[PDB]
Design a protein around this ligand. Structure first.
Ligand SMILES: [Mg+2]
Ligand SMILES: [Mg+2]
Ligand SMILES: [Mg+2]
Ligand SMILES: [Mg+2]
Ligand SMILES: [Mg+2]
Ligand SMILES: [Mg+2]
Ligand SMILES: [Mg+2]
Ligand SMILES: [Mg+2]
Ligand SMILES: [Mg+2]
Ligand SMILES: [Mg+2]
Ligand SMILES: [Mg+2]
Ligand SMILES: [Mg+2]
Ligand SMILES: [Mg+2]
Ligand SMILES: [Mg+2]
Ligand SMILES: [Mg+2]
Ligand SMILES: [Mg+2]
Ligand SMILES: [Mg+2]
Ligand SMILES: [Mg+2]
Ligand SMILES: [Mg+2]
Ligand SMILES: [Mg+2]
Ligand SMILES: [Mg+2]
Ligand SMILES: [Mg+2]
Ligand SMILES: [Mg+2]
Ligand SMILES: [Mg+2]
Ligand SMILES: [Mg+2]
Ligand SMILES: [Mg+2]
Ligand SMILES: [Mg+2]
Ligand SMILES: [Mg+2]
Ligand SMILES: [Mg+2]
Ligand SMILES: [Mg+2]
Ligand SMILES: [Mg+2]
Ligand SMILES: [Mg+2]
Ligand SMILES: [Mg+2]
Lengths: 119, 195, 194, 115
RNA sequence: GAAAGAAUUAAAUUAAUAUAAUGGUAUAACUGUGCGAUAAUUGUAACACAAACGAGUGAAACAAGUACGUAAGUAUGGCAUAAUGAACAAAUAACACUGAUUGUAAAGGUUAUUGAUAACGAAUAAAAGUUACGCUAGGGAAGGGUAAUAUAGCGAAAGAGUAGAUAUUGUAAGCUAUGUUUGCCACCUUCGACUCAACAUUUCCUCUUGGUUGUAAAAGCUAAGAAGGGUU
RNA sequence: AAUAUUUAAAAUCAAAUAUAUAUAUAUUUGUUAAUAGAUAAUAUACGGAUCUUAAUAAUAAGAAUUAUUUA
RNA sequence: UAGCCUUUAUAAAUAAUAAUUAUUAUAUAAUAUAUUAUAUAAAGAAUGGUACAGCAAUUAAUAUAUAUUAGGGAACUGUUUUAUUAAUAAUAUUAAAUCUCGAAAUAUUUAAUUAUAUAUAAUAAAGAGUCAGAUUAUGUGCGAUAAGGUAAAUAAUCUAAAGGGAAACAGCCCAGAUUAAGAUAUAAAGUUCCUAAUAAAUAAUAAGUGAAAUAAAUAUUAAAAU
RNA sequence: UGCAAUAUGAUGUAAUUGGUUAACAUUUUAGGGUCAUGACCUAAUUAUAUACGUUCAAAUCGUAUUAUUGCUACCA
């Protein structure tokens, strides 16, 4: 390993802030996707946009992907994840069975929220 | 007697493979089942050869033998066969000759177990500590009251694991094949089989 | 033995083998009017080992079974291969006959009346013999077959005689019922039961 | 040293026609070793146990209650038809063959008999 | 209540399958039996799998004839996947297609079959070595990485040490450090002597110190600080 | 206070969220630190400077390290 | 030759790409134990046998004052028993590239619908170049769970890619250069000075540990819970 | 693919214009032999190869069946 890839094993405080922001943005995209479906269904029933937003009942999504993406167990929200899962991923060939999240290729884009329960 | 020398009729040069990382949280082999005290791994999964286990066993027996009704149970078998070529050879020319046996021990598997009518819990702790110095990992001491380890930093008590029957569960959510079998016995299908 | 349901791997698991045996055993019902121990068949097995060289001797077995039993004998051919015994597979060595009904009754009667009460050291049929669920077997030596009426009359035409195996099948559920039954047909027993 | 490099190229087995596909006559809907899938309706089987459609239609994988523990492949004659057809209902047949309206073609066919 | 029949259910593919292994098979593809010896036949073969080409695999359907079955129907070899070889030049027979002025013929053509190129897409019918006396056009089609090995240390202590594992010694196994030996990868195509040496300390001597029932003294063993000077 | 174990959110406890909604069910999150071990050859090598705070006292400094966060 | 690229065109062309509905169940209402509508839950039409999980059959391993057969000495005094050992039976516990009784996500893939039409497929006539690859991440065969090693599989980049960041950097994080300008948002990364930009909250460190390449077994000290 | 020739004891050799299982020879004994050796006498051999027609007549001729060795056609 002569070639030097000086990638540190820990993140700076600023990388952590950006990571938390990126997770929140993804959650907000999911939150907005459901909102549109609820509003569109309500308009189909006859309601208007305003009352749809103020409706007490919120129509939950029926698609498999959106239904699971709204489950905290499957896709936890940033305020729900643990600090370890925010910044550390699971690698089975590393001491501690964990490695820095920034070492995952395209970590900024890819989403890894869930780790095995005991790892 | 053949724990470190399996008696496979046909010898095979097994692949290298990878030490399993029990992501599913299985506790098979991580609970005391024969004796009063035991030893298990704390670090990540590793492979232990026959020589290391033989010599760890000798250390334990050094303390078991001077005892009344002293028994040592070996919970590990060296199933995997590893072949090693000599250092002074070019890469290639196939796989090398058999050298020894190995065993893939995950993070929290129990290796040994001790019992006796007079153990005092101190000689057992000393014996296992010494035996651990001959093995290539980090090990600790377990008793019947110790929690079952399921990860590097996570523990579990098997008693709380739920118990459930699966025959009734299948009837709750039957599969397509099972429904067909049940539907085959119906009179409108059994009486016209033609067999 | 069925698999207790405690894992998701029992749904299609074949059932376990019986406790102490690899084959299922039948039930034993109390004796009533419908089921009373009774005879059903008698089979004569004759395996002339010496036929390995002289096949022509196997024919003499069929004649001997024919003359004595009085029914057509079905021949016995080899099935296994033991070189230590010069045994070759696919050769005729003996004959067997299935006896039922009146003809079996005559055989059993003429066996106890004539052949059995002619052995000098005869004590009876061992109590240890018998399949667990009905069925009793014993054996007649080479010289005992000379006692049959159809060989005693023509000793000239019977230079060579040789033993055989007898198996009495009955409706007895267990052995001890059969032994009591066969005793009624003038059969002695000498050993100690299990 | 002597090394074993002799290994046969894999046979391109597996399903060649998936559920819902529209098939024609003779199309191979599965190439498999043995009979993992038995023939069903409007479908045949060859020497290599290859399953092939006999009539145009829609290929469906189904299980027949008459034959438990046996998967099946067939060809429903229409999209809206569920392949495990009810036992006591008239079989769905396809005439297929057309009428010869042309006068010359009709004349030729009428005057055409087996040897 | 009893006898017989039709049988049903559970288990079974571990036996058996011409032949290796794999998949399948009791509804049997396995076994027994009658007829049979027939489809182990003949001209068109669409369409698919596979696929660079050459090739390879399944096969609906039309037409002629045969075997079995009361009939429905089945049979275009073997339960399936291996059991193979292009052209060229020759050889045999059939077709009636050309017939070099015409008639024949010779010769070619279509159809069916034959022989091995195993370096198995087969360069010829036919071909081994030596060069340090060598030549031309090109490519590299000690440093670096690794540390099995080697050196050294650390943890635990079986055992010696008159007694006591730890004054000294420290089996076999464990965790490491260096890149000083033997290796491995191919990114990168001179051993010794003379002269002058510079640097490191993992210290051979000199300086200070700890331990040494195994420090009585002197000589010694082990260890810590120490690279200023010296080291045929 | 002494002694012997482990350093764990699995179980328990606390808190948050979704449903039936004053409660219950379900999901999610929360369980130690420093030092020694520590190692070679042109030259110290976090890129360098340099970074740990202090009342009397300044218009005014008090991590520029580690962990979880805010604007 | 195929694979990947290019030029010109053809309609009876959307056939391309992407996702949704499909399925099971519960609750409410309408209709004649069933159908329909609405809401909710479930990894949600069809194919599969990897991870995981397990010891079912196969291949292996361990222990029983458990039982039986046989072997052997002693006791009994030749009997049975005992001391036992191998095999089988029973119970309990384990693993495997060529084991999967259970079983994912990804994946293969189907009809209709919707959205991409300044967009895709298919087809016809003509041209190439390439067939020495490299690194990173993941799952493996060989090696020794060594190599900037070797061989393949998936994705990205370099090859052929400017710019920002990692001091310097082909392969890493961003982000793709028509030419200008420079007002505003910014990505990765940063804000004591070198150097464009900062103020805070709660705990720990006293070792300059650390501060953009984490070195292990172990020993000491101290802190929480039982 | 076609053709030709061998193949006597167990030993290695005969020999034949058919009319023979012939001896040397190997082994077992016998005899003279102080004792041997060396002689002489016996006893076993040959499927004088495989199986069949003509021949008083078959190992002496060739076919059917064989075991070995050679020369040819194909040689893409
Ligand atoms: Mg496993
Ligand atoms: Mg294959
Ligand atoms: Mg077959
Ligand atoms: Mg099989
Ligand atoms: Mg294709
Ligand atoms: Mg083709
Ligand atoms: Mg057949
Ligand atoms: Mg040629
Ligand atoms: Mg003509
Ligand atoms: Mg002419
Ligand atoms: Mg001609
Ligand atoms: Mg050549
Ligand atoms: Mg020379
Ligand atoms: Mg080097
Ligand atoms: Mg000692
Ligand atoms: Mg050692
Ligand atoms: Mg020093
Ligand atoms: Mg002194
Ligand atoms: Mg000085
Ligand atoms: Mg919890
Ligand atoms: Mg330095
Ligand atoms: Mg090309
Ligand atoms: Mg479409
Ligand atoms: Mg596999
Ligand atoms: Mg399965
Ligand atoms: Mg290449
Ligand atoms: Mg490489
Ligand atoms: Mg290039
Ligand atoms: Mg660049
Ligand atoms: Mg590109
Ligand atoms: Mg551009
Ligand atoms: Mg520092
Ligand atoms: Mg910097």
């Amino acid at each position: 390993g002569g070639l030097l890839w000086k990638i540190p094993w820990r993140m700076s405080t600023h990388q952590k802030t950006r990571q938390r922001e990126r997770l929140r943005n993804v959650d907000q995209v999911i939150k907005q996707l459901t909102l549109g479906l609820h509003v569109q269904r309500c308009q189909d029933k006859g309601l208007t946009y305003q009352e749809a937003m103020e409706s007490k009942k919120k129509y939950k999504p029926r698609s498999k992907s959106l239904r699971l993406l709204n489950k905290p167990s499957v896709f936890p929200k940033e305020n729900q994840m643990s600090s370890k899962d925010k910044y550390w991923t699971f690698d089975k060939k590393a001491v501690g069975y964990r490695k820095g999240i920034h070492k995952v290729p395209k970590w900024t884009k890819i989403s890894i929220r869930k780790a095995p329960k005991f790892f | 007697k053949h724990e470190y020398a399996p008696r496979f009729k046909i010898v095979q040069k097994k692949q290298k493979g990878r030490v399993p990382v029990r992501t599913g949280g299985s506790i098979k082999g991580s609970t005391l089942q024969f004796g009063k005290y035991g030893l298990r791994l704390k670090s990540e999964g590793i492979r232990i050869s026959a020589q290391q286990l033989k010599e760890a066993d000798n250390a334990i027996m050094r303390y078991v033998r001077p005892l009344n009704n002293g028994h040592l149970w070996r919970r590990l078998c060296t199933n995997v066969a590893v072949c090693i070529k000599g250092n002074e050879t070019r890469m290639g020319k196939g796989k090398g000759g058999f050298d020894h046996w190995m065993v893939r021990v995950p993070t929290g598997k129990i290796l040994f177990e001790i019992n006796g009518d007079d153990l005092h819990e101190k000689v057992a702790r000393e014996a296992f500590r010494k035996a651990g110095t001959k093995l290539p990992g980090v090990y600790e001491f377990v008793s019947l009251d110790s929690l079952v380890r399921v990860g590097l930093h996570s523990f579990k008590n098997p008693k709380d694991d739920p118990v459930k029957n699966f025959y009734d569960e299948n009837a709750k959510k039957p599969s397509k094949k099972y429904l067909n079998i049940l539907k085959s016995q119906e009179p409108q299908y059994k009486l016209f089989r033609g067999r | 033995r069925a698999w207790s349901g405690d894992s998701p791997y029992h749904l299609n698991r074949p059932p376990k083998n019986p406790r102490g045996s690899k084959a299922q055993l039948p039930d034993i019902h109390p004796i009533k009017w419908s089921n009373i121990p009774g005879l059903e068949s008698v089979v004569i097995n004759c395996f002339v080992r010496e036929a390995r060289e002289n096949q022509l001797l196997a024919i003499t077995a069929a004649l001997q079974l024919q003359q004595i039993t009085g029914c057509k004998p079905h021949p016995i051919f080899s099935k296994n291969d033991v070189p230590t015994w010069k045994l070759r597979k696919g050769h005729q060595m003996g004959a067997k006959v299935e006896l039922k009904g009146k003809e079996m009754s005559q055989f059993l009667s003429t066996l106890t009346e004539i052949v059995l009460p002619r052995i000098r050291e005869y004590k009876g049929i061992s109590n240890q013999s018998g399949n667990r669920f009905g069925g009793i077997s014993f054996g007649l030596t080479a010289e005992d077959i000379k006692f049959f009426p159809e060989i005693d009359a023509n000793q000239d035409s019977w230079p060579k005689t040789f033993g055989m195996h007898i198996n009495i099948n009955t409706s007895a559920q267990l052995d001890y019922q059969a032994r009591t039954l066969l005793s009624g047909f003038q059969f002695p027993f000498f050993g100690e039961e299990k | 040293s002597r090394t074993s490099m002799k290994d046969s190229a894999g046979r391109r087995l597996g399903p060649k026609k998936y559920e819902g596909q529209d098939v024609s006559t003779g199309e191979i809907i599965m190439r498999q070793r043995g009979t993992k899938f038995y023939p069903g309706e409007n479908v045949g089987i060859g020497k290599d146990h290859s399953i092939f459609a006999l009539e145009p239609g829609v290929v469906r994988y189904y299980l027949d209650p008459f034959h438990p523990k046996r998967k099946f492949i067939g060809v429903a004659l229409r999209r809206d038809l569920k392949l495990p057809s009810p036992h006591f209902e008239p079989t769905v047949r396809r005439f297929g063959r057309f009428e010869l309206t042309n006068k010359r073609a009709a004349y030729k066919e009428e005057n055409s008999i087996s040897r």
